[PDB]
DNA sequence: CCCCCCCCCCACCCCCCCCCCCCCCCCCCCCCC
DNA sequence: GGGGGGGGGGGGGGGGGGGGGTTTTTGGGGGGGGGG
């Protein structure tokens, strides 16, 4: 007597598919979800009877957005939508399109049901999407076959690049040119369905109507190349690759190098021989079509500021599995906080180099130190492994190079006595200017590196001989040299009393399983956001006298200015809003100690 | 049939255009600064009038410059006819370029002053159509060259 | 430190399409019942 | 006064014609590195 709306091919009703996703996106609890999964006496009903999709409806209506994220196991947790699941992964654009209508349906009636007053105009505008994850098995790319040309799949892999957002049209816009009527068409699967005749009966003129680009309305597509991550490739051939669409407010979900993992209809088109012709090669282009893309406190913060040993504490927590170096630990955790910046450029930049023997600690140091800041790199004074210190010209693009990658971070160094004169001549305006100054191809600019450079160097040959100064031992010249705030040696001269604790320390690492290591890093980004200090008036006296006395002892501004930027670096350190005699007496300490090498 | 949309715009701004009133760090007497452009663009037989976005804003409680940005391609013809019924008010020589026939003056609407600046990267197809403005540098250009108008 | 070397990068059939012609169909007008 | 038939216009379909469809060597400049 009726009509019945199927999902075409598989004789599943769409009020069963969308009464059946109904009553889990409402009365759902998260409970159910402990029940599927291992550790199921982990349930907690002050925890878990929420009504899971109800709390994030709420959130994302009060926060007025379109997109909700669906666990896929969640449906099989729940009794009147297990089914529901199979019909997801085998049909997945009608089911997809079947649960986007209903959670605009759930908006709508949320506001008239639960009846609190709302913009009903706003949600009868807007478009709504589910985001389906975690459909099933991460299958392999090279495992893909013609079975799956439909189905909901998830794929894993690395990002090589994006195109640029292409505009998609969804509805043509068509203006009659005699006159001037106006109707909107959309895009049924990728075709203009042309009005042959103007629509009103009153000019009906045939082939009149003209597409008006610039009317019309467009979605987002971006196209994206996914390589074949190397865990999964077999050891004797290239890796595979697949393009994926992805579309809307999921565009640049990701950028180039970026491993992820995506949910997504497997998808194949025919491709033209050629475009004059509607004649179409015997095999499709597959690609992926995407619904669901991933990748790969203050309290504390004040309680520790308390501490009376923090200098101390934080120092040895940088690098606790190596034996005591402690000087260099302090001067790389003040590295770590650094100074301030100014309008007028003077900067809070602190730079640290590391000399003597090769076969030392300084190595694991600046992977230290790299561990732990947040955007900074490692890298050698010479050559690229791809990877390469200076910006560079390439084909045609300029390239940043690792000192200017690490803007805002540590730039870690080593084989620095060994590094290329060019190179040696361009640390120059990155140690004064913080920038590298690019005059090539039609632009012109001072490409600002704004790094904090950890050096890591070595005397000639195997063995640094302490009775010659440093510029004796090692190759680098004095005028980059001095540029250091603080320069260290680390030699391997034998010392039991030394040696025998270092083994002892080392080979304890094998046995055992403050030191707020991991809690550093917090500290570290807490410091750096909230806490800027400024010299106190005293503290001008103080720099000025200990200044005059190091002078009266061949020094010069720049190590006034070094100590400025240690003391600021230390008032970071204790959360100090304001530098301290102490904290100018402790940089121009450490200062001290350095410059008599 | 006529775009009345269209029409109330040009409608709108063309009373804007020609008595929107202002002045300041001056006497209290308005300088009705657009027609004072089109005076200016009279005296030194200039093409194109700059409009700053924020006049309109502040104007008709901003209807009309929220019009002007969202659908800015359909009704630029429509400002366009409101403009040349103002010059005709205040500055009828400027209606042609200025007997053979010297041919009609074109128009160059140049709005400046926009809310926000969007970046290169947040171009997004909603927006085709609309009024932005757009930052970047310039990497390369081309050789002026004439294109076919009418 | 200076000069020279050497290294790098770069320049004839088939389909789509368009035009022309013929027939058929639909409307309007006139006549007949 | 309404229905049928005849005649003319307008539209659609079918047919026919036509046109289109990368590495390897050589030379030059510039940059980088090594030896006296
Ligand atoms: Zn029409």
Redesign the pocket.
Known sequence: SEPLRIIWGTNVSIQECTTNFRNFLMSFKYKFRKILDEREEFINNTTDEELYYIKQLNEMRELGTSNLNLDARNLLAYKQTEDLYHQLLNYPQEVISIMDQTIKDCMVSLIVDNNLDYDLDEIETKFYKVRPYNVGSCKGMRELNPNDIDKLINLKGLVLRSTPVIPDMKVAFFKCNVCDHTMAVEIDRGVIQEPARCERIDCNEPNSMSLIHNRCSFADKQVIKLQETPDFVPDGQTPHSISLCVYDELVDSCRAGDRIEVTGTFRSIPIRA?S????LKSLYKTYVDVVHVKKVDLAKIREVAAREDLYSLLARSIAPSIYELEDVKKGILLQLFGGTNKTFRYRGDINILLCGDPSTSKSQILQYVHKITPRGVYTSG?GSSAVGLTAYI???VLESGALVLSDGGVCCIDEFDKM???TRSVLHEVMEQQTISIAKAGIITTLNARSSILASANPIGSRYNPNLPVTENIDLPPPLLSRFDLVYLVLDKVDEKNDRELAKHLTNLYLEDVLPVEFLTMYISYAKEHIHPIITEAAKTELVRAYVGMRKMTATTRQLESMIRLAEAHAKMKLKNVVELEDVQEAVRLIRSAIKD | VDDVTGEKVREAFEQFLEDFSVQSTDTGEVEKVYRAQIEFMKIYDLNTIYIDYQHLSMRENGALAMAISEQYYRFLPFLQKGLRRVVRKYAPELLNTSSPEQTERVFQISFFNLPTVHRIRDIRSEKIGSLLSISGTVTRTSEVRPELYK
């Open positions: 050629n004059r012709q509607r004649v010479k390439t084909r045609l290329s004169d060019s």
